[PDB]
């Protein structure tokens, strides 16, 4: 699935629950290291709700496995996010995306 | 500079003379300034003639005769509002049989060897309209049936009465004063 | 004292620039003199703006906003090349415009907004793109023609406004007459709807238009149908399918409201 | 010649063809800019009439068969093998001149560019070959800018060939201009071409120059220059310790930078080696520096993940102790007294080493160099000596900028020339032989 | 500056700093070099670190010729010593490399057959050491981008290396990685029999396995013992280091051997599955040189250093953020500051046309393409490009255009489309509207006032690429229309103040580059209608102070602007007149 490496520890007790939206700052990077997305650049925290299939699946289980206040790295294989078509104009076909995700708040 | 802009636009390469709101407004403004119109004294009439001469000089000194020739030439014999305004401007600058304007126009035409001017003049003459019994009868039938008139004037008969009169007044003003040069060149 | 007015300020600045330097840029010269003419002819702004001024009741503000957004989409599609997505967007916009109640309540507003011209111009672009290669994007021409015919049927004034463009629709007539299931959705049908059951418009109809239709009918009666013979129809010497459409238009041209326009 | 007739029998009017092509180029030469508006307009009208007459007599086609008959041969050497050797030299010039002739014949003429649509596909099929790329690109640009109809036939393969021209022939702005003309023509945008150009060029990130906003990174080092050499009095083990008093994880959108470790000079010069003086480069971004960020070991701008108990990026109140062993090249770290499970080994020991820290904005750290300067929160490993013990006796230990130039008043800035080598760093006694 | 030499330049930005100008130079009429500049002059110094650049055609020593490959031959690139055996010839070791690198796989998997041949990822190039050139002076292999060593004497023993030995908890080294910038071998030691090789020039063949990172070398048809194992994602540049002992030294033979792709199939993506060897014009020989300049940053990071005490050690404190945009050359794996393009003309032109292509692909409301472009050019990049004062004029104009095209063009166009149409609702606030603000018949400031005419709705969508929804493809991407507004007002005020002094150095290098993009952005914001009340009053005071007094400093109208700026001012005046006309129409509707 996704590999999670911890940059900064979190509380370790609060995790996302079903139907609970998550507020995250993330930075998207290709495997070579090129950046393609950053909620930090947009200066707006990104809000998505756990399990409505509104975000790429790898980001979904990565956020689910993360805890509140934690900063973790998400490595998403091509199959789990943008399998073969990729994102037209952004993500090339068969690309692995590395995400630097911080779970700011749970609500 | 405005007259030069219009002259360059006229002299630019086009298949058709595009309607220009700026030209259509400023030509009218210049014509009004030129003409600017009970028995009056000789001194009053002379002051009117001399004032008209100076008012026409303010334009034909800056190159208005060449502009009004170039626009007619670029018209390529298509009747339109641009030609209607240009003819009015030419009449305004030529009123009174202005010999200086006549000479300027003659010299410009001769040195440019402009054939499009005369071709467009002939084309405008063919495109000029006349009375139409069919149109008059149709419009009278509409009136008799009593349907509210779609347009107040109903000018389908004699489509443009002002354009024809202006076109021929321009050509008469060209030769006024027994200008043998135009009388032969035309 | 000081200028104290935008009109005076612009009138001074334009003349000052022009007499200060010989402006090299024709666009700059045009902009300068347009501003000067606008400042001097203050009443011209009103005589131009007032025809495009419409007042609406407070209850219909949201529906007017929605109709305006749809019309903005339709107009913006004028600046883009035709495509499948453009086809879908215009079906969306036209459907919404038809469903809007303002479209049935304020015909003068729709005429002033000039949407019949916009729809006509888009259909014109579609037809002029690949005119010889049958009719590309048939749904665009069909929907445009249906909407234009509905526009004609809404009001008599709308019918006259659309009749003012009858001439060009006649050169754009011979497009989709041969193909069935598109009957009633061609520019010829739009012209017929513009002249349908209006004595004023039938009388104002000119002879050259009838001559154009007669030449089209003569061509259809003289030579076969290329599209039909390409699909494999027997090669008879003439084109009844399109001849019938031209005859149908001539019927509305000559006959109106039980009587026959003798002229 | 194609039918393989004898070269003597075949008569190629090579010289006359070249001279006529030059004459035709001069005849279709566009008006000059310095000319007056009236003369320019007259000459443009004459050019338009000449172009109409030529296209109506069908000169565009004749030029096309000439171009095709010249491309049946691959190269000038091949054409010199088939035909005469003089024709071999003239082959490139004639082929170019024909392309400029086509460009001048169709330039600015709507009707000619409309009739060129049928052959437009044939034109783009030879864009890849180097002998005609410039002329074909110019003709393509003229056709695209003039004729809207020509854009309606450009397909996915045609656009991909144009992009492959960037891929293989290098960076060129004219083909970018051709692509822009493909996107927009006469105020009308073609969504299909826009989408295809986007989705076929942008995602690769291999042709267009890439841009990113990067924090400045500054490096700070003590005065000590410790190294290893034969027959010289330097202790080969050293130890220093760094404390993080405060660190903002994100002062800006980009993550903050904080790396600690050792760096090596090139030779015996005092300058840090292999790295740029300024930029976003820190410790570990070259092969002369060896850094640790709390999660990765950095060397040569490549990071390797190292395991550590409760591993985390360097936070506030984090203590890093750096160890250097020059007897067997080894650099080891210990975070909060806990040993990191990795080390740098068998590096280059030709030059001198020194402690170094690299940081971006939002960093407040303190060097614990031992003794008078500081006290170690953790006991040094056995053998390892505190770094203050390497200071030369007269000089004073100072933490100064690793690079020469810092932030200061412009006219007071000290421009520094090349420095001398530190032969005194390694005190190798050389008594004379007796 | 010589060895251990220190000096300072005083360009006289502040005349009082100059110490002998008064006694000599002032009366004579000489002016300080920075007589009137609002910002300091950028220094350019000699770069210490050598870089690889293409061999100049006018190089006095190096000659590079491209040999086209026939059916029986292979594409070859020959390096030739032009001035060998001549006076002042240089015999030092010269470092050569090819422009494009071979990129190893991101993850390492753990006659000729066409299927194997197409499915393989192994690439090959060979170098022919010409007869008469000593093989001991020639090294052949691969180098990475980090190689910047110009030692006069070069040996394979002094290549920069490191071994990162990751270990487990117990301390057992589960893996160790050797990392180096140079992976090359010497031909003299590579050739085993020695002496006579004149039957054919010494042919060292380099074989690279992109799927495993194995670097094996073939010398005269036999595998050499030396092999290099590299780590994933390494970009290896073919490279030959040679010291010229003959006019003909070596030759880059770009061919293939049995069951191996040629180098072109790995270098180029369009030729990935083409077994035929190729040498496109992009690939060319580059040599390591010292002739390059470096640009000092105008501003450095502020670092404060002090010894707190004997206990607390030395404090290092940097609390102020500083940033620069980096231009990354994809093929060279190199990044330079974007402000370095003021002297690199070809890169400046290519990037300006790239910006124009970015503007064109998203033209006329291509919202999804604009969203895609938000990835390549981001909000901080756009804001930094807009605000930076040392930006080249062309790049500044391009970035101002790109911002408008991506974020503002759609709504600006919509409002311009619905500008001559006045649909005025009949509401109470509409009835309250009057021609004149008070009983005194004095015009109010244009734009300011209650306007009730119907307007298009402002709607934007957040450009997030982790989302998988498609509703974001409607509407232009969101942008901070408030930060942008304040920044635009501030920069307009600063430009008005500084440009009136007629400084020698405006932003972008010319007054046009300084003003036209800024006024274009200002006009776009005005059309969009972001400006409200106080901002509109301030921007009107900027245009002309005397006319728009509420209820010396000279404005743009009499600032003596160039013609392109005058056109933008005409556009602004047209918008103000349109606002007045709309106010008149609304007042008439209110009276009615």
Residue numbers in the entry:
A (entry chain H): 2 to 108
B (entry chain D): 3666 to 3702, 3710 to 3858
C (entry chain D): 2053 to 2315
D (entry chain D): 436 to 869
E (entry chain D): 1207 to 1316, 1414 to 1854, 1889 to 1929
What did the original publication write about this model?
Ryanodine receptor type 2 (RyR2), an intracellular Ca2+ release channel located on the sarcoplasmic reticulum (SR) of cardiomyocytes, is essential for cardiac muscle excitation-contraction coupling. Structurally, RyR2 is a 2.3 MDa homotetramer consisting of two functional regions: a massive cytoplasmic region, also known as the cytoplasmic shell, which comprises several regulatory domains (NTDs, NSol, SPRYs, RYs, JSol, and BSol domains) and the stabilizing subunit calstabin-2, and an activation core and pore region, which comprises the Ca2+ binding site and the transmembrane domains. Dysregulation of Ca2+ handling, characterized by aberrant SR Ca2+ leak, is a pivotal pathophysiological mechanism in a spectrum of cardiac disorders, including heart failure (HF), atrial fibrillation, catecholaminergic polymorphic ventricular tachycardia (CPVT), and other arrhythmogenic disorders. Here, we solved the cryogenic electron microscopy structures of ryanodine receptor 2 variants linked either to heart failure or inherited sudden cardiac death.
Here, we present the cryo-EM structures of the post-translationally modified RyR2-S2808D in the presence of low non-activating Ca2+, conditions that resemble those of RyR2 in failing hearts during diastole. We determined the cryo-EM structures of the RyR2-S2808D channels under conditions that resemble diastole in the heart when cardiomyocytes are at rest (concentration of free cytosolic Ca2+ below 150 nM and ATP in the mM range). Treatment with the Rycal drug ARM210 reversed these structural changes in RyR2-S2808D, resulting in a conformation of the cytoplasmic shell that is more upward-inward than the closed state of WT RyR2 (RMSD = -0.08). Treatment with ARM210 reduced the RMSD values by 0.18 (n = 4, SD = 0.025, p = 0.0004) for the three CPVT channels and the HF channel analyzed, strongly confirming a common inhibitory mechanism. In the present study, we show that the beneficial effects of Rycals in HF are achieved by reversing the primed state and diminishing the RyR2-linked diastolic SR Ca2+ leak, and not by preventing post-translational modifications, as previously shown.
